[PDB]
């Protein structure tokens, strides 16, 4: 009875964090704390507190004064849809959310409990570095919480939601996760900070214009989603876990669906031009196929000449990769090569379907793609493709362009299925060069050799690349109505839902870097 | 390279000094935090044997990621040369020590001062040793010997990686 | 260099430990020092140390004034006989050689890296306890080496050498591993120390009373070996992993053998009594059997009714159990069921193949032994031999009566061969008895009752009793020449040497606790 209220005395004053202007500093920047966070990942009453008591042990340089309850992460797990989650949120009011021995002894307790249980793991982010006055014994930490992201990579979905400052090593955590959400204003990411670039450099740059969730979203690519507020953002982390399995050993969970599946799709008549010039949304025939037009999209922000979303076909989560004409004329480059690989890589280790939509001219010609590694970076994407085990279909709107259209899962490199639209031009589109040697007996001829090229080019592509070519010689299982896209891929899916396939026996393979 | 000799069952020594990251827009805007991570990956994914000799400098994130005790290495030596920490003397000093520097008539004598007491305590090239980050300061002219007669006790380390189709490095 | 100078005084003051006093005070008690004892155990110049410059971070009870190198604790591997072989050994001369937090950190280390190489683990232990000052941290620290010992168990051999004082918690790491040896006089093991005993029981005891080598060697069971001298055990260190596999995946290493295979056992003859009342020393019939008259024996002055020995036949390893006529008449006990379970089970999960000599009345009669649970600690030696794999060859010498037979690697619990001797009564009871029960009512009825009784015993002990009758039946494979035993030994292994059995799908049997 003096037990109980010395218990609920240390609780409270657990919960409360060190001081209430910690509170007010935090609040001040536009900043939640971690509890307040935590409240908003998880349904109402689920979260369950571990190590709530636990203080540090240090010594030195003023820690013995400053034990606060936590040490500066709080760690337990809830639900989300009723389902369990595991979390870790950083308390920046306890050494600016500094990583202590202690502290990281928990992170790595509870990131444990999320791979021994074969459920998700979201970290709420806000501290990095070691805490100086603890030394490179609390940098070690890391190491803990690296090996951890690299055990649980493809076993359990993991989210790194960055709600504050995250210099150096504490980012490359994020980096190892599957999805990184970013708030604007609040949060930065970099692994050498503004003041040193500046020393060194001697480049003067802000901490948002070095790191900030806009650098992240658009241009790095470090970031998959940015929202302006802390509440839509874990309004979205719950949404994108209600698409994920809790592990590699189940499908993502279906849905009840109103939405026919025999519902025609008349609108891509209009959508998609018949004149190859002319660009369009992608995005708008994706929401016109889709379950209710929703889809969660990926990196929207970067690389948008592709497309990599989650939706539903039939109430079951599919991850759609398409080109975006709209967007340098819908070509591959390095930055969507690296974009579409990481999806269709997720997607495969989590049981996700993949439906690729192709309307692809080719590769982003120039000097900056061939000298930073597009051969290396395009290997990347096709890599993820070959070694899928999903289901995986393809089908063909418009152009499919040489190496491009054998990269974006042909059948050639082991897609299940591929269609085609009666508006298919699928090509090698070298024959504008190869014209000269193959029909240098006619050139020759001249009486206007120009204009004997470009008729007999045109008498080529008549012969090898009409749209019925492609199907003619099963490079394609079947040109369809436009208009049946939906049902197909529904069918088509369903028919493949029991795929089993076996991957080589290996420790890894060596996909490109 | 990490992942090619892993994967060919070639052990893997590995020699810091490395006083950091290239700081810049130009590395933090192409995602040094991505391409950092996979150098990471590679050595925390790694089950041949692993072995770590700090020669000089291992700064912060940097000392982690090449090969630490604490991403897995088997063994981890360094010469009597090392300096592993967080970040610089003055740096850390600096931040601690901001009330003390401020007041006093001679702020540089009292800055000098915390400085040599932060080196004293936490930076010196025995503190990573007293505290089994490393497993031994050795003689550098011993490096050959020691490395040989670690691999020769690590040749048959089997290590068990996850059940999985494959992990999801960064791309 | 000033460094290389440096380097070599702090490795020169780790080594000779905190003063100069500490050595001779441990020479006084005729004790060698941890690096004389780790000098003992290996190869010349095969040692390799981790951990040399380790020191505590604890603070209570005036701990940060002394922080020596390397703890209390000098961990690293070296060679036995060329094979790679783990050892940590306490050092006394510092707190005692008491268990410290960051003590604890080097033994888990040291441990996982016996685990990961699959080599031996040897423990010199002259430490006990937690370091009081240290507190609960520091026990949790045994915690650890408990995992790791039941980890490990079955997979790499674990040799405990006790060469100290043993309190506490810590015997129970010795307890889990495979062989405990014990120096006399000098080394102790106890839970509870004398102190304690005296304030709560009020019994008077001293440390050798209560837990010496003599004890625990003789009484107990825990103590595999004893010895005089560290110098001695040490050197029967040693040779026991000389007769050890390196880890479960192998088979002991074979030797070369001179001792030819060839018929030598014509002194079994007279070793072996026709009368089946007059003892012999079943060792004296092992050492004309096995190459060169060498074995090992294990717990050989605990439940001296029943013989554990390692010996080789034409070079291989052997594990031999055997009735000891000598002692107790050579029945089966509490104390010989455990002895011979624990030795069994031993080599079977080391691949040692096992031979059973037979020469067993039946159990040990009383309330003590049916109190006590004869009949759980029994049932561990039955599971121990149903349960194992290796080759199993059992040869009965003269008596094995009951359930005693069946349970010493009958063919009815799964011995690959039974051989018997000419001198062989294999029977369910003595014939007095089993004519007792048979003939019970024409005893009670007609004249000269004392008279046919002797009547129907002679004829059973000449129709059912005789050498042939198991034989004619199939209980046994053979009866052969007594002075053929090496031979048939040598020839049956050999045949069996490419065994494979299957263990059933489990987490693990539930033997007889």
Not at 206 to 227: I, K, M, N, P
């Amino acid at each position: 009875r003096k037990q109980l209220d010395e218990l609920l005395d240390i609780k409270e004053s657990a919960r409360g964090g060190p001081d209430p202007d910690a509170t007010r500093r935090q609040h001040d920047k536009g900043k939640l704390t971690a509890r307040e966070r935590i409240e908003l990942l998880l349904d109402k009453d689920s979260f369950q507190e571990i190590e709530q008591l636990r203080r540090h042990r240090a010594t030195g340089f003023g820690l013995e004064a400053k034990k606060p309850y936590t040490d500066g992460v709080i760690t337990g797990w809830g639900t989300v849809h009723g389902r369990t989650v595991f979390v870790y949120a950083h308390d920046f009011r306890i050494f600016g959310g500094a990583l202590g021995e202690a502290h990281a002894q928990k992170i790595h307790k509870l990131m444990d409990m999320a791979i021994a249980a074969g459920a998700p793991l979201v970290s709420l982010n806000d501290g990095a570095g070691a805490r100086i006055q603890e030394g490179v014994t609390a940098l070690a930490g890391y190491g803990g919480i690296f090996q951890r992201n690299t055990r649980a990579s493809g076993v359990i979905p993991q989210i790194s939601v960055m709600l504050g400052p995250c210099a150096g090593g504490a980012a490359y955590s994020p980096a190892l996760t599957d999805f990184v959400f970013m708030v604007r204003g609040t949060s930065q990411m970099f692994i050498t900070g503004p003041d040193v670039v500046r020393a060194v450099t001697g480049e003067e740059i802000g901490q948002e214009g070095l790191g900030g969730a806009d650098v992240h979203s658009r241009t790095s690519g470090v970031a998959h989603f940015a929202y302006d507020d802390e509440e839509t953002c874990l309004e979205e982390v719950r949404f994108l876990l209600s698409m994920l399995p809790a592990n590699n050993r189940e499908s993502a969970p279906a849905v009840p669906c109103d939405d026919p599946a025999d519902r025609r799709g008349q609108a891509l008549y209009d959508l998609v031009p018949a004149d190859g010039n002319r660009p369009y949304d992608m995005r708008a025939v994706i929401e016109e196929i889709v379950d209710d037009g929703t889809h969660l999209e990926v990196h929207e922000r970067w690389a948008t000449n592709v497309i990599c979303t989650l939706a539903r076909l039939d109430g079951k989560v599919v991850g759609i990769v398409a080109n975006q004409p709209q967007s340098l004329a819908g070509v591959l480059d390095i930055a969507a090569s690296e974009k579409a690989a990481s999806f269709v890589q997720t997607c495969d280790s989590f049981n996700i379907p993949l439906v690729t939509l192709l309307d692809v001219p080719g590769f982003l010609p120039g000097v900056d793609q061939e000298h930073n590694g597009i051969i290396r970076h395009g290997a990347k994407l096709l890599y993820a493709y070959c070694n899928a085990t999903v289901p995986r279909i393809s089908l063909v709107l418009r152009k499919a362009y040489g190496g491009a259209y054998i990269v974006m899962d042909s059948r050639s490199i082991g897609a299940d299925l591929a269609l085609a639209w009666p508006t298919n031009e699928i090509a090698v589109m070298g024959a504008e060069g190869a014209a000269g040697v193959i029909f240098r007996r006619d050139i020759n001829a001249a009486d206007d050799p120009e204009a004997v090229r470009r008729q007999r080019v045109e008498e080529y592509k008549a012969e090898l690349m009409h749209p019925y070519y492609a199907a003619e010689r099963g490079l394609v299982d079947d040109v369809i109505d436009p208009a049946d896209t939906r049902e197909v891929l529904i069918r088509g899916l369903a028919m493949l839902r029991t795929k089993h396939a076996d991957l080589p026996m290996r420790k890894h393979g060596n996909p490109p870097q």
